[PDB]
UniProtKB/Swiss-Prot annotation, chain A:
The basal body constitutes a major portion of the flagellar organelle and consists of five rings (E,L,P,S, and M) mounted on a central rod. The rod consists of about 26 subunits of FlgG in the distal portion, and FlgB, FlgC and FlgF are thought to build up the proximal portion of the rod with about 6 subunits each. Belongs to the flagella basal body rod proteins family. It is found in: Bacterial flagellum basal body. This is Flagellar basal-body rod protein FlgF.
Swiss-Prot record, chains B, C:
It comes from Salmonella typhimurium (strain LT2 / SGSC1412 / ATCC 700720). Belongs to the flagella basal body rod proteins family. It comes from the Bacteria. The gene is flgE. The lineage of its organism: Bacteria, Pseudomonadati, Pseudomonadota, Gammaproteobacteria, Enterobacterales. This is Flagellar hook protein FlgE. It is found in: Bacterial flagellum basal body.
From Swiss-Prot, chains D, E:
This is Flagellar P-ring protein. It is found in: Periplasm; Bacterial flagellum basal body. Assembles around the rod to form the L-ring and probably protects the motor/basal body from shearing forces during rotation. The basal body constitutes a major portion of the flagellar organelle and consists of four rings (L,P,S, and M) mounted on a central rod. Coiled coil: none annotated. Belongs to the FlgI family.
Curated annotation (Swiss-Prot), chain H:
It is found in: Bacterial flagellum basal body. Signal peptide: none annotated. It comes from Salmonella typhimurium (strain LT2 / SGSC1412 / ATCC 700720). It comes from the Bacteria. Belongs to the flagella basal body rod proteins family. The basal body constitutes a major portion of the flagellar organelle and consists of four rings (L,P,S, and M) mounted on a central rod. The rod consists of about 26 subunits of FlgG in the distal portion, and FlgB, FlgC and FlgF are thought to build up the proximal portion of the rod with about 6 subunits each. This is Flagellar basal-body rod protein FlgG. The chain holds residues 105 to 208 of 260 of the full protein.
Amino acid sequence: PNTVAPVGRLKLVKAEGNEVQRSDDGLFRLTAEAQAERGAVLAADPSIRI
Amino acid sequence: SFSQAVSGLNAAATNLDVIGNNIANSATYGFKSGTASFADMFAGSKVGLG
Amino acid sequence: SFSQAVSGLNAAATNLDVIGNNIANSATYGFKSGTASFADMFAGSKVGLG
Amino acid sequence: PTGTNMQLKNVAAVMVTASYPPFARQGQTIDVVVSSMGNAKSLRGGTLLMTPLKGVDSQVYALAQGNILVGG
Amino acid sequence: PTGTNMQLKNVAAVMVTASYPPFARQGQTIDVVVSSMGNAKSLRGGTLLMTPLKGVDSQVYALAQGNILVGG
Amino acid sequence: MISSLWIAKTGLDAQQTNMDVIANNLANVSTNGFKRQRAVFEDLLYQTIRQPGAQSSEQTTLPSGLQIGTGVRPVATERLHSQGNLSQTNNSKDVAIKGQGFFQVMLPDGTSAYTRDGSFQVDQNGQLVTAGGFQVQPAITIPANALSITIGRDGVVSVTQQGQAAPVQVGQLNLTTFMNDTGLESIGENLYIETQSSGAPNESTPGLNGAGLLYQGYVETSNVNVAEELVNMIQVQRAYEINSKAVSTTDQMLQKLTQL
Amino acid sequence: MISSLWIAKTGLDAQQTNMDVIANNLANVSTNGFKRQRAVFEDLLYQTIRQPGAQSSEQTTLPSGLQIGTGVRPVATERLHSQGNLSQTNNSKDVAIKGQGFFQVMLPDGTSAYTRDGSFQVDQNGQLVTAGGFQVQPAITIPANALSITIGRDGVVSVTQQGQAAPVQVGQLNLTTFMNDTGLESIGENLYIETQSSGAPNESTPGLNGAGLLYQGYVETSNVNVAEELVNMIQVQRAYEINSKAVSTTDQMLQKLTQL
Amino acid sequence: VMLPDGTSAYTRDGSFQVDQNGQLVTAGGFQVQPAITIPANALSITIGRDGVVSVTQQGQAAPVQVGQLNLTTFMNDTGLESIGENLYIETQSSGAPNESTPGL
Amino acid sequence: VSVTQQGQAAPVQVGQLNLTTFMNDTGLESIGENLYIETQSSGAPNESTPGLNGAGLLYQGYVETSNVNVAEELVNMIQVQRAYEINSKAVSTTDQMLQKLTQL
Amino acid sequence: MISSLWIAKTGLDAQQTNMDVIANNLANVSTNGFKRQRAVFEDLLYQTIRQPGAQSSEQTTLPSGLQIGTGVRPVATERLHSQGNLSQTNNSKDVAIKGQGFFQVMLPDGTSAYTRDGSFQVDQNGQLVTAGGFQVQPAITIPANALSITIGRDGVVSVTQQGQAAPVQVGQLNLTTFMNDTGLESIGENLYIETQSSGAPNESTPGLNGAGLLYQGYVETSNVNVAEELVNMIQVQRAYEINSKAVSTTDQMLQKLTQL
């Protein structure tokens, strides 16, 4: 068990209801207005806790 | 600690046997008295066996 | 009371041994008789030690 | 102190290999290859500290120190 | 005091490496590379305190102190 | 399974050891050259539930914290080396020591043991031996044509032959003394062997730098005192019964804890 | 999950601690230089609810308002440093203390520990050590050919050699006294070490400003009073009974709420 | 308690553990603020009534002072925001976190 | 460890019992059969002689027993059982509320 | 069904095993040369759930995560191979061991077993057999009209014939020693067979290489100490009772689940 080492970090984002829209396959994506202001890809929020 | 005391009881009985045999031969030409000698049975020190 | 009594028992035994030694040396030229002196072993003044 | 616990994370022990070129003269520079030796995750932007490059005869023929370039 | 617990967070122990240029004269300035040595997260806006740069012969040839520039 | 049970399970064992020592001493009340034993005890672990002296506030210390202790353990049984009373057997072959020395005897395996028992016999070959048949140092031989054996206060063994007005010296008996006599390892049969806690065997002659004197026709009896052993049996019996009562009280507490 | 159950659990734990202390005291009856221990308990916190002394009404105040207490918790176990009754073992090396002093020994680690037990032996090198082999300060060296060792009331150790009418002094036994004697940390093995609550070790001669007198041939037995221990065992058993009954009663109440 | 993001939370769960690099942390591993670092050679660890953390070292008849476990007091404790992992963070209705030595 | 052979009056040293001291004891991983392996929370196993560097002493002829307090476990069983009986009742109440809701 | 039920079942089985060992020790009080048994227990598997030492944050670690243990199982049974107390039976055919040796006898299958019991008889052929009739390798045959049998401390068996002033030698009683005496496999009838964990059989005479000495007329009694067995019976009963209470608690929990 001494071998345990970090490998990668999950990307955790913060988005409200008014910014995301459910695509046809059930996966949420950024709406047009919200995407235009927050960019194409959402930056990971360091405050999110899983 | 029962065998240790039983051994002492047996030794005392042997001593008294010798004393009685010596007394019974108080007047017996050519009789030489008997004497019992005892030695302890220590095993490895710190404990006695009798 | 089992350590204050044991002390008195031992003192009486010592006195009796001294008396027996005096008796056994009744006929011994140049022998001087012996006597035992006892003293209390008080501690606080309310607690006797024998 | 001899009795102490050091638990580093920014230091890696490495082996440096190089080629001594023909007719090499003192003061010239050569390229070196830096390879990690024990349980190190990466050598991305590390700096090689002063390293004496020995020959087969265990004599120092070069001194190595620089910045490592890892592909990425 | 010798017996005390210091638990710092704004200080990092680093190794400084530089090149002594040809015909260098005292009073001139050279660039240095600052590399962390143990379990330090970053050196973003740190300042290098007075550091004597030794040679192979363990003699001080330069004195280093300045502000570190980390890419970001 | 509970702390008081282990503590009272150590108390029982220590008192049983004390009874064993007492019974062994009483059983050997008549063996010559015997040294009686004394068991010593010491405290076991002490759980520092509240370390004594801990700094509760920044200026007030806690005196004598919660130091819950474990039971007892015995260090060892030490031999009370004292001079037993001498008796008069009047057998030219019985010798008794007056000081603090030991006789040296050669074990069959080639090593040497040390005994204070003076009941010596003569084997078929004429050597002085211990009653257990072990040949005693220094291998004092006794001729077949012996009329009387005289062992003096200096350990000189002399034998007077027939019709000769002068005695013949057949050896010299020496005594071994140790720095610590207690540390000797008893191997039974009234024999002790050397241990590193007993230093080294210093051989000496009987009357010089600290070996004892030898008296012929005398036997050294044991130093066991019967009355003190009786009183000690009474106290040990009471202590054992009280510790068993502690065991029973713990058992009742556990029972009526489980029954709720 | 319910307050009364936690309170009764704390009571049960305190009574078990008291029984553990009693069992430890009874297990060390035969230990020489042992001091019996007594535990002292305190209550734990107090729920405020209604602050007493508050204004019950514009002109009147609440006398002794509603305080709800938690269980109990042991503060500390204090030793009873009193002269244990003496006993005559008739040994030249056993030493007992009549007053309030301690013997000093050196642990193998180099530190100094303190013991009141005086059952001493001699090692192979001739130094006076305890039963556990620890060398007693101040390091009295007994020479090879000793005939008798005399330890006086003031701590002088003398050896009488052969043929010399005068005794040779070979050391000086001192006693260490503490301001707070109960604050020492007991490590077991009849050994106490200095803590910051036990002041500092003051060396003194045995007979001076408050060190005790040394008796040769005597041992200080434990001060455990056994009848008191039996009565306290009865008390502890009954208290554990009552606390277990409180637990069972709380168990019966929660059952009816479950049934609801 | 110091959260991984760098902001401070507050907890009343007093069950702590020393991590590999000494340091007292909560059951989840978050370091308890401000730090108390217990060495390896300690024989007994005592947290006092006032919060002074002293340890016993072998041969040293005196304890070594390590740290003070000061607490944080709010004005309206009921206004704190419970974030889950037994932690409270300061909210608009529970401002002004006042650090203090316990007992004061 | 000293071994006494027949004839020799001096014991012969055979070996040394070295104690491994950790700085965070509770961080060890219990691997089953009365054995613990080191983890990242209990790093740097320090070999030492018993009695030095904070290590413990050795008593021969004695074995350390379990430190399980029995009354604590029984009271804890009482608490656990009644707690599992109050959570089950909460489940039943939620089930009844759902049944009443979806019945209309 | 539920984890706690299996764990408490394993606990009950372990306590039953402990009671079995206790009863086996108690039933063999009068058996000559019997060695008491002890059980060793270990933890069962440990469900890992959270990995202790896992990375909880970028700079923090998970200290001592969620390890859930299974029950308990006995590791092994170890004997206490120590010298039992000797008993004088005043029989020329009974021999006792003073050290750490074994008698070698031959099973009817031709393989050799090892026994520490010294109660020997003489068959119609005169060969020294044990109480069960196994021939004590090697030989010791006995002449027809023996008057007395003398077995020395070093295993020399001699017979005194009529009209002959010198005893004749009829055998040599030897002892077998093992590297590991606890590894011998008990088969009953006071017999131990060789295994691969008991090393190799080292044949030797009594007095050399460590092998013990032989005493004629004595028997080696069992080493079972009763008081320890009684305290352990109390321990086993109370632990079994606690584990049964845990089983009952699990049963009530499951029943409450069933009712809903």
